[PDB]
Every structure is written in structure tokens, then in C-alpha cells.
């Protein structure tokens, strides 16, 4: 039996907010990366450090620690790029037309063409951020969405996880009802948020596809952790 189910909606929210990883900085230097080498250099370094925080964040997600070590590994291997991206999209909300990878690393579409083969992915990230903006996505909602991504993305490849997912659904509704939304607005907004998760998955798939391409591996040396997270998606 898990403790996650016995939590209230407000308790679920507080736990997720308190588990939030910090916003990390990129390596400094006035840089202004205008080559895929330096650009990917900064991104992979940042991603590697974020991954360490994500792993410990996941352990504080209610219900996750109740899983076996193997199931925990699977879910993280499956969802890590999705989780990185929705975090990026979240940070970039108050910066339209720009992606805030780090407070000292704010990039526009022009710089996003330096990597290339992925400028569509850059545009998709911008589009998702703009979508969050117009929906006025709240922090309490964001941490629920990120939790859902962690538990759902590899839930197949079992009643426990689905029971926790239902709990987060109850939590999401609880937040909207607290915001004064009517019943129709509640299930409409719930749907709108969850459909974006399909787009999150798509960006991860396409994003992954480029990242574990042999050419992109050779651009800049990747960490052993980042490599093992990539190899988990090997085709």
C-alpha cells in the first residue's frame, strides 16, 4: 500500500511544489553561441546537471518510491527528455519568441538554426510555451503535469501507477475548482492540458531521434549518464 493515495489534493500540491528542482545556470562566458558545437556543448552540459536533480526529484514524487528499482529506472529512461522539455517550456513562458534554457542562456529562433535538423523542434518548443502562456498555466498545474509525464510515459513498456495518476487528476481538478472555474471549464481545461502532453511526447521523440544519431553524438562529447539515457531509446 502507498501513502500517495492517502494524501489530500492540497497535500499533493504542497509535496510536488516542495519537490521542485532548482533552475540551473548555464556555463558563463559572454558566449552568445552561434555554432552547433558551442550550442550543443552548453545544452548537454546543462542537461546532464539537470538529470541529477530530476532523479532526486522523481524520488519525491508521491508513489514513485513505491515502485521497484527497475520500474523507477524504466519510467525515468522513458520520460527524461519530456520532463526536461516541459520544464524548458515552463521557464520560457514569460519570454515570448525565446527559449529560456537558463537565466543566463536565453535564445531565439535565429540561434536555434545553428544546430539545425532540429529548428522544427525549436519552433515546436516555442509554440508549446506560447500555448502555456495563453492558457495562463499555473505553477501548481505545471508540477502536476510534469508528475503525470513521469508516471505515464513508460507505464506500459500496474494498478498502482494508474491509481496515482487518477489522484493527480483529482488534484488538477481541485486546483481548477479552487480557481473558481465552472464544471464545463474544468473538464475543458483538463483536456487542453493533457493534449499538450501528446505534443510533449512528439517533441521528445523527434528530439531524441536527433540526439542519439551518430552524427549528433560526435558533435560534442556527452556524459556517461546522458549517453545511457540516450541508449535507452535505441531506435
Amino acid at each position: 500500500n502507498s501513502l500517495a493515495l492517502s494524501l489530500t489534493a492540497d497535500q499533493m500540491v504542497s509535496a510536488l511544489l516542495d519537490a521542485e528542482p532548482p533552475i540551473l545556470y548555464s556555463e558563463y562566458d559572454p558566449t552568445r553561441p552561434f555554432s552547433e558545437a558551442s550550442m550543443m556543448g552548453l545544452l548537454t552540459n546543462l542537461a546532464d546537471r539537470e538529470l541529477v536533480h530530476m532523479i532526486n526529484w522523481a524520488k519525491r514524487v508521491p508513489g514513485f518510491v513505491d515502485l521497484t528499482l527497475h520500474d523507477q529506472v524504466h519510467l525515468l529512461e522513458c520520460a527524461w527528455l519530456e520532463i526536461l522539455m516541459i520544464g524548458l517550456v515552463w521557464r520560457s513562458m514569460e519570454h515570448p519568441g525565446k527559449l529560456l534554457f537558463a537565466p543566463n542562456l536565453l535564445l531565439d529562433r535565429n540561434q536555434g538554426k545553428c544546430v539545425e535538423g532540429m529548428v522544427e523542434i525549436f519552433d515546436m518548443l516555442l509554440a508549446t510555451s506560447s500555448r502555456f502562456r495563453m492558457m495562463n498555466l499555473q505553477g501548481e498545474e505545471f508540477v502536476c503535469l510534469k508528475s503525470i509525464i513521469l508516471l505515464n510515459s513508460g507505464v506500459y513498456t500496474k494498478d498502482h501507477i494508474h491509481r496515482v495518476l487518477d489522484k493527480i487528476t483529482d488534484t488538477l481538478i481541485h486546483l481548477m475548482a479552487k480557481a473558481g472555474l465552472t464544471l464545463q471549464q474544468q473538464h475543458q481545461r483538463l483536456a487542453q492540458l493533457l493534449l499538450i502532453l501528446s505534443h510533449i511526447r512528439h517533441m521528445s521523440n523527434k528530439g531524441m531521434e536527433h540526439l542519439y544519431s551518430m552524427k549528433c553524438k560526435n558533435v560534442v562529447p556527452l556524459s556517461d549518464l546522458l549517453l545511457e539515457m540516450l541508449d535507452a531509446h535505441r531506435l
Binding site: 532523479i55 523507477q72 529506472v73 525515468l76 545511457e228 539515457m229
Partner: peptide
């Protein structure tokens, strides 16, 4: 063996 294996324990 995986790095993720180790990191999830500590």
C-alpha cells in the same frame, strides 16, 4: 550495470 541504477539508491 547502469549509472541510473546507482543514482536512484543514494
Amino acid at each position: 550495470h547502469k549509472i541510473l541504477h546507482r543514482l536512484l539508491q543514494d
